[PDB]
Design a protein around this nucleic acid. Sequence first.
RNA 1: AAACCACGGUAUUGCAUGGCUGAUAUAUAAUCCAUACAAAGGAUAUAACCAAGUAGCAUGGUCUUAUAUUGUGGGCUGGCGGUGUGCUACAAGUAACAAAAAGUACAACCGGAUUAAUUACUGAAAUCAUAAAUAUAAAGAGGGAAUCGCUAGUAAUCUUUAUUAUAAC
RNA 2: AGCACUGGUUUCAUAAGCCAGCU
Lengths: 113, 118, 78, 92, 117
Amino acid sequence: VQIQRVTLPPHQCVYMALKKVFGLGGPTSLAVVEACGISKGVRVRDLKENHVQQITQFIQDNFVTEDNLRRKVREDIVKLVNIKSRDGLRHDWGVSIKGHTSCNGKTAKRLRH
Amino acid sequence: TTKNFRLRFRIPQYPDIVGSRRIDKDQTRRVLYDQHEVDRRLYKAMTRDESLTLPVRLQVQRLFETEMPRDSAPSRIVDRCVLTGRVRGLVKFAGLSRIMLRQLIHYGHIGGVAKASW
Amino acid sequence: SYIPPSEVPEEHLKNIYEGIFGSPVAEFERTGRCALAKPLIGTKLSSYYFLPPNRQPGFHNEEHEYAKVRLMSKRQKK
Amino acid sequence: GRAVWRGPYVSVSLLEQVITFAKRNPEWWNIGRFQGSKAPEAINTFCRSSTVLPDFLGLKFGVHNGREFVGVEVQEAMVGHKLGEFSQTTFR
Amino acid sequence: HAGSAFMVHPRNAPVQLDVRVSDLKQELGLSDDSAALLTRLAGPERLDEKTKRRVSPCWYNSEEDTLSIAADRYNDRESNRRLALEQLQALVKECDTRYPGETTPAKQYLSGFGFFQ
RNA sequence: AAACCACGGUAUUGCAUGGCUGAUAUAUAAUCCAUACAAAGGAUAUAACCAAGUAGCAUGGUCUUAUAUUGUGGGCUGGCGGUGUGCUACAAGUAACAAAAAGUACAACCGGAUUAAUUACUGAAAUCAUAAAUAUAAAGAGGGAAUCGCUAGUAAUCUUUAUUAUAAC
RNA sequence: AGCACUGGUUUCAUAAGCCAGCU
Ligand SMILES: [K+]
Ligand SMILES: [K+]
Ligand SMILES: [Mg+2]
Ligand SMILES: [Mg+2]
Ligand SMILES: [Mg+2]
Ligand SMILES: [Mg+2]
Ligand SMILES: [Mg+2]
Ligand SMILES: [Mg+2]
Ligand SMILES: [Mg+2]
Ligand SMILES: [Mg+2]
Ligand SMILES: [Mg+2]
Ligand SMILES: [Mg+2]
Ligand SMILES: [Mg+2]
């Protein structure tokens, strides 16, 4: 079983497995399964073809997913860079946007864009 | 020519004369706030009243700057020691800095306050 | 019709109670009442500093006297 | 940020500066600004905490940074931000 | 207190009024329904948990069968007593009108005045 | 702002000084906490070599109408390296979630850093304050030489209060 | 790779010694 071309582990619960989709988390994954009539006791290996199709259709209509979500986030960052605001310069430089980070800013340095 | 003598206090409870700095300017701010307190409260109520249309609320916002000085804002007032004028280390319940309060307590000039142990 | 006193809506009871004793103010309202319900502290702030008059009628100015003794106790300037 | 239901903040001094500018250049304000012509002059201000209006479109602002007035020409993408985000105070 | 000549103590103004429901019913000839409605309107006392300070102007105590009213709106001791007495009469008028009962000299005396409302 | 005027100075000398403080810390006590139905442990006080520290305040010498007093914005937070004191974790599932299907999820879905969009709250003013929520879901699998605290209601671990417009690890 | 260098640790401090990183 794969939804949005992400392979869902067979032995895990459906609402737990859907978290692997970029754009769905705990609270939102639970909403999707229950909206389709699936409770927390249903596992991936218990799903059928019709169940998968319902989930895939519901996700596409309500949520932005892996590729479109990544593009949207990047376009937001690029706009700030072109505007040349304070935050935009920090993104271009590859450092955090907080006021005082001369002592602890390592995470923002290794997660550049 | 004109003179402006520094504010100093000579009290029998302390062997030395006590001087202070920059209390007059803060007193001016406290007086100005009391002068404009009534109008400020009225405009605060109107700007946080959801029943009014905003094109009216935006115009009321402009009254905070045209009808009263910036120095009547309550957020720009600080508490200074009444004897020395020091801001840091103030003990609010007595109105004196920790340096003066400790010495006065030792000689019993503060009612009811004494050393503690337990 | 006869309505027993134990079957009266709480809404009507609240309206009667608040109509007599007043309506309390909630924590976060947007009616503009919080500003007008806070007590005024204009006088409490402006009477904080210890500012006795420089010259008290009938008494000597000890601070002025203190300064004069200091000048006499050392050499004159220029 | 500022609560949306309470509106923006704009300084009164900034509004007075723009009103005077409009009176000086009525033709550009009504017609020229939309064809794309550049502003005939710049407005210097200290109001770094004011929000940028689209009625400030084609206007040139000199925003104080501590030493001089840094030129800032308003674009559509700058709408909604403060004037102080486009005038840097520190230099490396 | 030592500062009596320089500031008026804030606790001089508040006053409280207490009345026993059983005696009040007998004096004014209130019916059982009227008494029950009066107790419901008062209700138990409400104290905020942040400060444990009573915030209910009116409350009813079941153990002592007492109806209490607190008045602290004004700065004057007497002005609060006048306010408290008026509020007590307003409650009686409302309960009596909904559930009329027996007539007594006290009720007739109040009716001629109109409950001072 | 002071009239046979007592100008002001966060200017300088702490190696000219007053006052106050760090720095030996056992032992003792008509002192404090607790006690009243059987107990244990603490707190406070107790004279210093160190030219040790001192733009709170006071003071001798020297300097200065103004080295004074004031308005707007900016800075003290600053694209880099070193490192002290703390908080949050991971080896070890004795974890995690929880209103018990006498449970639920997972097999470090343990850990909760960073960034995007959004809203509320305080305030005259919130890009460079705080909180919540949605998405994102980083380092970390017990750590070199070396080094610190403590010896029982103590270490370890958990909750709460106060100093106290908004804002404590 | 490593010698060497580089950063630390130890000492009242210098040196020596020690530990990693790196070529
Ligand atoms: K303990
Ligand atoms: K900390
Ligand atoms: Mg996910
Ligand atoms: Mg100066
Ligand atoms: Mg010395
Ligand atoms: Mg020395
Ligand atoms: Mg020292
Ligand atoms: Mg300033
Ligand atoms: Mg600092
Ligand atoms: Mg573990
Ligand atoms: Mg977890
Ligand atoms: Mg493990
Ligand atoms: Mg890992």
